Amino acid sequence: GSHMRQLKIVVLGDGASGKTSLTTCFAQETFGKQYKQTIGLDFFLRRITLPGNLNVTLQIWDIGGQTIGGKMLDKYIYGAQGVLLVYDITNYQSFENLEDWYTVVKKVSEESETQPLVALVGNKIDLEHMRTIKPEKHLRFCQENGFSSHFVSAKTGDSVFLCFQKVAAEILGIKLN
Amino acid sequence: GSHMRQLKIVVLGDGASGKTSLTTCFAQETFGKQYKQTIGLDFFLRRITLPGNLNVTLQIWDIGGQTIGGKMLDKYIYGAQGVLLVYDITNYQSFENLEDWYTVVKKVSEESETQPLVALVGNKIDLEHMRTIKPEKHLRFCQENGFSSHFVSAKTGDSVFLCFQKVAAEILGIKLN
Numbered sequence: 148g149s150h151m152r153q154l155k156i157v158v159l160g161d162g163a164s165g166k167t168s169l170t171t172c173f174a175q176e177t178f179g180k181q182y183k184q185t186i187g188l189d190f191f192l193r194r195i196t197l198p199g200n201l202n203v204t205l206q207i208w209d210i211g212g213q214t215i216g217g218k219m220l221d222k223y224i225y226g227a228q229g230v231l232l233v234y235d236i237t238n239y240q241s242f243e244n245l246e247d248w249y250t251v252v253k254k255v256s257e258e259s260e261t262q263p264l265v266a267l268v269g270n271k272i273d274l275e276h277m278r279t280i281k282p283e284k285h286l287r288f289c290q291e292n293g294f295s296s297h298f299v300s301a302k303t304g305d306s307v308f309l310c311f312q313k314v315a316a317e318i319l320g321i322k323l324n
Numbered sequence: 325g326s327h328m329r330q331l332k333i334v335v336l337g338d339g340a341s342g343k344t345s346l347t348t349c350f351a352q353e354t355f356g357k358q359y360k361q362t363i364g365l366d367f368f369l370r371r372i373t374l375p376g377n378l379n380v381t382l383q384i385w386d387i388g389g390q391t392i393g394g395k396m397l398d399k400y401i402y403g404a405q406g407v408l409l410v411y412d413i414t415n416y417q418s419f420e421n422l423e424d425w426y427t428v429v430k431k432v433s434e435e436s437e438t439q440p441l442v443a444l445v446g447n448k449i450d451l452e453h454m455r456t457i458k459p460e461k462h463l464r465f466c467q468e469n470g471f472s473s474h475f476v477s478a479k480t481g482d483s484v485f486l487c488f489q490k491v492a493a494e495i496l497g498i499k500l501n
């Protein structure tokens with residue numbers, strides 16, 4: 148038997164952001180320095196146990212950065228329980244581009260009459276010394292839109308599990324304490 | 325609150341088979357005569373209530389027939405709880421081609437060490453008078469591979485809901501009586 152408690156989590160953002168690295172760090176605990184661009188999308192599963200022995204499977208949709216240029220993106224976002232808006236904290240364009248991704252998220256939420264939880268994820272915090280996006284601006288963007296806030300490093304693993312765990316817990320409405 | 329009981333159901337088969345029509349008949353009860361080819365894939369959700377007030381959401385992945393020619397297909401099949409192998413009962417090639425689709429299903433099942441339930445779906449039973457695939461052969465293919473057996477018409481709606489309901493119930497292991 149199984150609850151088949153499965154949450155669709157879509158990971159969005161520019162090609163510099165580190166979406167695949169974040170997902171692979173979480174889903175299989177591994178990292179690669181050489182960039183291999185995701186064409187279209189890829190899919191991962193990882194089951195975690197939340198407090199109270201609450202088992203949940205995250206169905207992670209790792210979307211390719213080029214998809215923002217087409218119409219397939221709207222279909223990929225449809226039915227999401229959670230959305231991660233990922234940017235590279237050292238790359239201003241990756242942050243600026245989140246407006247485009249989030250516009251699509253809102254459009255799909257409006258027409259599907261849904262409301263997936265949205266998380267802003269500043270990746271590459273191992274590169275904090277060459278950070279270009281101010282933490283204050285990250286916070287402001289969260290406040291303006293009701294996003295949850297995360298800072299992570301796919302490379303070191305810093306806060307990656309905690310990010311996905313928090314997103315799952317927020318979707319279900321469970322306290323992490 | 326919600327169980328978030330969500331099952332990934334992948335719909336596979338040749339471009340003649342009527343996958344999108346089957347999915348749209350189930351998910352929104354509508355039908356179109358003019359063929360509009362699915363590029364890549366599309367995704368649908370429909371929640372149903374099984375006996376005992378058991379609520380479950382089918383996440384239906386409507387795969388484009390052209391995807392068999394590439395490598396993206398393996399990714400789409402990954403993590404499926406159920407697979408529909410759909411053919412047009414009037415179109416021999418659509419039936420013959422199921423060997424190609426099922427080869428990929430088995431390959432993914434082997435490497436993911438999983439075992440999604442597989443259903444053989446003969447669509448277009450409204451065209452039974454021009455049927456080319458014998459029911460005996462459909463049955464034989466099911467027996468050889470342990471498939472569940474369905475005959476449906478996306479056009480008339482004949483047995484479409486029952487097909488998806490049975491697939492969901494078999495995945496969960498619930499008696500329909």
Ligand SMILES: Nc1nc2c(ncn2[C@@H]2O[C@H](COP(=O)(O)OP(=O)(O)NP(=O)(O)O)[C@@H](O)[C@H]2O)c(=O)[nH]1
Pocket residue numbers: 160161162163164165166167168169179180181182183184185186210211212213270271272273274299300301302303
């Ligand atoms: N220093 C550092 N580099 C990272 C981190 N995460 C990813 N990278 C690097 O950033 C590059 C892009 O990573 P990748 O995960 O492929 O990004 P993506 O967002 O999936 N791109 P695409 O949308 O094109 O598939 C790679 O060179 C990768 O090693 C991180 O936390 N720190």
Ligand SMILES: Nc1nc2c(ncn2[C@@H]2O[C@H](COP(=O)(O)OP(=O)(O)NP(=O)(O)O)[C@@H](O)[C@H]2O)c(=O)[nH]1
Pocket residue numbers: 337338339340341342343344345346356357358359360361362363387388389390447448449450451476477478479480
């Ligand atoms: N008579 C009849 N025609 C059907 C039935 N289901 C689909 N068709 C017809 O078969 C054609 C293909 O249907 P469609 O659902 O687009 O097929 P598909 O399997 O999704 N194709 P693709 O993989 O290219 O997207 C259309 O002309 C459609 O009207 C059915 O049950 N009966």
Ligand SMILES: [Mg+2]
Pocket residue numbers: 166167168183184185209210211212
């Ligand atoms: Mg990628």
Ligand SMILES: [Mg+2]
Pocket residue numbers: 343344345360361362386387388389
């Ligand atoms: Mg189609």
